[PDB]
Write a protein that binds this ligand. Structure first.
Ligand SMILES: C=CC(=O)N(C)CCOc1cc(Cl)ccc1Oc1cccc2cc(C#N)ccc12
Ligand SMILES: [Mg+2]
Ligand SMILES: [Mg+2]
Ligand SMILES: [Mg+2]
Lengths: 550, 405
């Protein structure tokens, strides 16, 4: 059935004309198939036989029991205007509101049920080949939205929105989601009258030309939908299958982090950090990537968790929204969102370093941020946060932190591991502590170098360093002073690089050196770190410079 | 009744920016506002054959929700039209002792937009959880926030203001976007009266109107050195570092006498008397910082840049410059806290932007000390201006916080 819906006007991209792709010849069986499909389509008004003056063409083919006609609109799609991008995201099951009754209608032949702008039909012309070009072929054109054309999804959705409006207007109880050529209808009517309202909507759509599945012919729960399983009281993902392989390609790993990512929206604890590190060798999708020990342990732990089954619940707007976050170690975080205490709407992870060096509080605040953005998209509000960090810890951090930060309303939940500041630098020099003047240097050519110090108690030292950079040596100088000092030390450096990295107070790094410094700073009681401009003869600094340069 | 033709730059296609997701509360506010704008003819629903999009936000300028459209992308793509083809900044406005800002953006809704250009004003009200395709509109009249609107309405504005500039030749009126900047040298109470006359003159000619500034007091903050009773080695090292930094800017600064006080390898906490030569050198350095810099001129073709630093305790420092080290203006903003970091940054950005508008007639590109997504999420919760400057997010921690302090 074709629609008395009005048509959307369509233009080609300015300065382009219609496609003229020649028709490849076909086997006499495929040619008979198209003749019978095209005459059945001609009868229903979906296409019309055209004169000889149409200069356009698009190749057509056949394939299979039932033969199906397929047209290659690649060249026309390159030439037609842009449309309002159809919906990219999809509804997230954790955002669906709980409903007593739910129905799934598949609109059949959806695109072919919608008229196509008159002036644009000429550019859809195609041709059924004649046997051995003995005579001319049969010219046809479309009068409805072709399958595979660029405009069809957006104009069909447009048309379907308009069609539904009058029925929605006189039924403010029913809720209709549209998605592709489907509609999902929910209500809290008695299943009897809900079966009635469904039958009305079916007839409304059948008047606008939209066939819909006979009741007692329409899908039943649980629904396999976009990788999900939707039961009437709960949802979960479809079963995930992680391959066992002796070797792993770049492509194999991408497929693996993919499925785990997917699993993490309801399976708490999924980790992908060590696995995704492997792909920093972005190369041919064929390059075999030897696995790490940490990547073996990660993947093994994931299989453990995937062994038990999990489910999420649906959303009730009257209940609060709540997010809890727990540390997972090695910079990986995990979170749940729920309204009632063990009934999760969904879960997820957060592991990004986004920088070489970070610390736990910064990562926790980033995790709260990712949840906040996700809650808005999914429910249109932000949750209350339950977080394993005390107000004193977070207040001290966000107050000293040079960057601006938004602290949601949250409550301390006492569930170790808690988030803490493993150390804090002094804000004022330390009296009675030895003052180390540090420096390092390397030859930018030979990459050999040295780190050393000169203190106020008269101690001096120089350590030789191989295959290093000026930057690494400047941290090495600081590391040396930590190693050789008592529990309180004032260090003075001329290195803005090294100052910046320590003042940021990381507790975790990709650098082996920086991890070592961190271990030292924790064991100290008081460290003060101070900066002076290089090569200005300050004193302390001047002597280490002369030392380390000789 | 007749519309002014409007064109985009050569070979430039309209904006296709993504709509940011919104809280249910902001969506319901947008749907009410737009349902009424549709009844009044100001916007109309659009179909899938329009691929253009500009982001929209709900804010409060009061208790009543207001709609704000980010026409930054559409503005860049029309700019010849409204910067060259049409509209002029006066240099005396920064000099007046009072300046009042008047929202006159509602005047634009009296003027039809070129029917061939309306498709470029498309915008989308998003749905929650991608439940439905957003609601899509375009504009029938001149929109607030498009640089074309003041340029098209200019002639009408000149006619309506010409009486008033006759009576008050020494009052300065500058238009930027949806606002009018009105500067007098009058006593404050006379000033607010002169402002009221203009509002009444505006209203009785059919221009509804709903903030006073004092550019007299603005300045470039001079660099300040500590004054202590007893200095330690650490204080002299900080002092030598800051002065070292300041001499990329002021040439005459000297550190020889100061750093001599540190010759040798001394404990950081050790008290160092300020010798006389050192003290006189420091005293000379405090006088050098009193003056301003020498060769620092605004170039109208180059972008203005604003850097901002968090100083803790509600203080934020900022500098506006076009080339590094060559500050056109610097400042410190303070907050009488019930406040938070994002409220404070968001407020500071609007002050700096107003100040920049008054002084030069354009808005600077901000280097903001905040995580992008945190900014993208909360900036509307305190935004009251009707314009939106460009920004980017600096993730390098300024170690120069101490210096501009
Ligand atoms: C089955 C149980 C259930 O979901 N329940 C009790 C509550 C939430 O569900 C809805 C809620 C509403 Cl207000 C409307 C339609 C709904 O149902 C779907 C919403 C979106 C996509 C859907 C996709 C399919 C398929 N295939 C089926 C139903 C969908
Ligand atoms: Mg990262
Ligand atoms: Mg050095
Ligand atoms: Mg939009």
């Amino acid at each position: 059935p074709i629609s008395p819906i009005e048509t959307v006007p369509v233009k080609l991209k300015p300065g382009m004309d219609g496609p003229k792709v020649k028709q490849w010849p076909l086997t006499e069986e495929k040619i008979k198939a198209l003749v019978e499909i095209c005459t059945e389509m001609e009868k229903e008004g979906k296409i019309s036989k055209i004169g000889p003056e149409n200069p356009y063409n698009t190749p057509v083919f056949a394939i299979k029991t039932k033969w199906r006609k397929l047209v290659d609109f690649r060249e026309l799609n390159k030439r037609t205007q842009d449309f309002w991008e159809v919906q990219l995201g999809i509804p997230h099951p954790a955002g669906l509101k709980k409903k007593k009754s739910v129905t799934v209608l598949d609109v059949g032949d959806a695109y072919f049920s919608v008229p196509l702008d008159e002036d644009f039909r000429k550019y859809t012309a195609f041709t059924i080949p004649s046997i051995n070009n003995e005579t001319p072929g049969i010219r046809y054109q479309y009068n409805v939205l072709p399958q595979g054309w660029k405009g069809s999804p957006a104009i069909f959705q447009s048309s379907m929105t308009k069609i539904l409006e009058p029925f929605a207007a006189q039924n403010p109880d029913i809720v209709i989601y549209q998605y592709m050529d489907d509609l999902y209808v929910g209500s809290d009517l008695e299943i009897g009258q809900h079966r009635t309202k469904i039958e009305e909507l079916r007839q409304h759509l059948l008047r606008w030309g939209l066939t819909t599945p006979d009741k007692k012919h329409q899908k039943e729960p649980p629904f396999l939908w976009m990788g999900y399983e939707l039961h009437p009281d709960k949802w979960t993902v479809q079963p995930i299958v992680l391959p066992e392989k002796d070797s792993w390609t770049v492509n194999d790993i991408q497929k693996l982090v993919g499925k785990l990512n997917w699993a993490s929206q309801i399976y708490p604890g999924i980790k992908v950090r060590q696995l995704s590190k492997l792909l920093r060798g972005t190369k041919a999708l064929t390059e075999v990537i030897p696995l790490t020990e940490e990547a073996e342990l990660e993947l093994a732990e994931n299989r453990e968790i995937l062994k038990e089954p999990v489910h999420g619940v649906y959303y009730d707007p009257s209940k609060d929204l709540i997010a809890e976050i727990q540390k997972q170690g090695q910079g990986q975080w995990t979170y749940q969102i729920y309204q009632e205490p063990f009934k999760n709407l969904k879960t997820g992870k957060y592991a990004r370093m986004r920088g070489a060096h970070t610390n736990d509080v910064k990562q926790l605040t980033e995790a709260v941020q990712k949840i906040t953005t996700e809650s808005i998209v999914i429910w249109g509000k932000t949750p209350k946060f339950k977080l394993p960090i005390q107000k004193e810890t977070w207040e001290t951090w966000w107050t000293e932190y040079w960057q601006a930060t938004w602290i949601p309303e949250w409550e301390f939940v006492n569930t170790p591991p808690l988030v803490k500041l493993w150390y804090q630098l002094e804000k004022e020099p330390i009296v009675g502590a030895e003052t180390f003047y540090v420096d390092g240097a390397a030859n930018r050519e030979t990459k050999l170098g040295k780190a050393g110090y000169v203190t106020n108690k008269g101690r001096q030292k120089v350590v030789p360093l191989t295959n290093t950079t000026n930057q690494k040596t400047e941290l090495q100088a600081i590391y040396l002073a930590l190693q050789d000092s008592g529990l309180e030390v004032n260090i003075v450096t001329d290195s803005q690089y090294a100052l910046g990295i320590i003042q940021a107070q990381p507790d975790k790094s990709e650098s082996e050196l920086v991890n070592q410094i961190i271990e030292q700073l924790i064991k100290k009681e008081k460290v003060y770190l101070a900066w002076v401009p290089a090569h200005k003869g300050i004193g302390g600094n001047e002597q280490v410079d002369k030392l380390v340069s000789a | 009744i007749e519309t002014v033709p409007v064109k985009l730059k050569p070979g430039m296609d309209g904006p296709k920016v993504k709509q940011w997701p919104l809280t249910e509360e902001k969506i319901k506010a947008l749907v009410e506002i737009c349902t009424e704008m549709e009844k009044e003819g100001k916007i109309s629903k659009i179909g899938p054959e329009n691929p253009y999009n500009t982001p929209v936000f709900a804010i409060k300028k009061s208790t009543k929700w207001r709609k704000l459209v980010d026409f930054r992308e559409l503005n860049k793509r029309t700019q010849d039209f409204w910067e060259v083809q049409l509209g002029p900044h006066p240099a005396g406005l920064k000099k007046k002792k009072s300046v009042t800002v008047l929202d006159v953006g509602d005047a634009y809704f009296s003027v039809p937009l070129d029917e061939d250009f309306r498709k470029y004003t498309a915008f989308t009200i998003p749905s929650i959880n991608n439940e439905t395709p957003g609601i899509r509109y375009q504009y029938n009249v001149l929109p607030q926030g498009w640089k074309g609107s003041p340029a098209i309405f200019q002639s009408s504005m000149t006619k309506i203001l010409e009486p008033f500039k006759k009576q008050n030749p020494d009052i300065v009126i500058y238009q930027y976007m949806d606002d009018l900047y009105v500067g007098s040298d009058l006593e404050i109470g006379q000033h607010r009266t002169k402002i009221e006359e203009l509002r009444q003159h505006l209203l009785r000619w059919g221009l509804t109107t709903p903030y006073e500034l004092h550019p007299d007091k603005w300045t470039v903050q001079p660099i300040v050195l500590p004054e202590k009773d007893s200095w330690t080695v650490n204080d002299i090292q900080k002092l030598v570092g800051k002065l070292n930094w300041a001499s990329q800017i002021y040439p005459g600064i000297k550190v020889r006498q100061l750093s001599k006080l540190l010759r040798g390898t001394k404990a950081l906490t050790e008290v160092i008397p300020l010798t006389e030569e050192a003290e006189l050198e420091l005293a000379e350095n405090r006088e050098i910082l009193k003056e301003p810099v020498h060769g620092v001129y605004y170039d109208p073709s180059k972008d203005l840049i604003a850097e901002i630093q968090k100083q803790g305790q509600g203080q934020w420092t900022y500098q506006i410059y076009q080339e590094p080290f060559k500050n056109l203006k610097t400042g410190k903003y303070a907050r009488m806290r019930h406040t938070n970091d994002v409220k404070q940054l968001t407020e500071a950005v609007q002050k700096i932007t107003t100040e920049s508008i008054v002084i030069w007639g354009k808005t600077p590109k901000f280097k903001l000390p905040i995580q992008k997504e945190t900014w993208e999420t909360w900036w509307t919760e305190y935004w009251q201006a009707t314009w939106i400057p460009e920004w980017e997010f600096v993730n390098t921690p300024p170690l120069v916080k101490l210096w501009y302090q």
